[PDB]
Amino acid sequence: YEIQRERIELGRCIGEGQFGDVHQGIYMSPENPAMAVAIKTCKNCTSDSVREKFLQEALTMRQFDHPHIVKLIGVITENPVWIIMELCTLGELRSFLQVRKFSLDLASLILYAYQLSTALAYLESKRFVHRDIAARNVLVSATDCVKLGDFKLPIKWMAPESINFRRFTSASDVWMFGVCMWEILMHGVKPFQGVKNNDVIGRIENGERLPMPPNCPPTLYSLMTKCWAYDPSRRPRFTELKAQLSTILEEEKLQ
CA–CA dist 128, 120 (Å, integer): 9
The answer to whether 40 is a known ligand-binding residue is yes
Any long-range contacts for 132-137 (C-beta under 8 Å, 24+ apart)? Answer: 132/157, 132/176, 133/157, 133/173, 133/176, 133/177, 133/179, 133/180, 134/176, 134/179, 134/180, 134/183, 135/93, 135/94, 135/97, 135/180, 135/183, 135/184, 135/188, 136/92, 136/93, 136/94
CA–CA dist 74, 192 (Å, integer): 38
PDB resolution in Å: 2.0
CATH 3.30.200.20 region(s) of the chain?
A: 1-87
CATH architecture designation of domain 88-255: Orthogonal Bundle (1.10)
The answer to whether 115 is a known ligand-binding residue is no
CATH 1.10.510.10 region(s) of the chain?
A: 88-255
The one-letter amino acid code at 169 reads T
The answer to whether 253 is a known ligand-binding residue is no
CA–CA dist 67, 93 (Å, integer): 17
Point out which residues pair with 85 in neighbouring strands: 38, 72
CATH fold, domain 1-87, is: Phosphorylase Kinase; domain 1 (3.30.200)
- Identify the experimental approach: X-ray
Backbone gaps in the chain, preceding residues (C–N over 2.5 A): 151
Catalytic residues: 132
80 prior amide bond cis, ω within 30? yes
The answer to whether 74 is a known ligand-binding residue is no
For residue 88, give Cα distances in angstroms to 69, 76, 107: 11, 20, 21
Cβ neighbours around 126 below 10 Å, total:
10
- Residues with Cβ within 8 Å of residue 125, at least 6 apart in sequence: none
CA–CA dist 102, 89 (Å, integer): 20
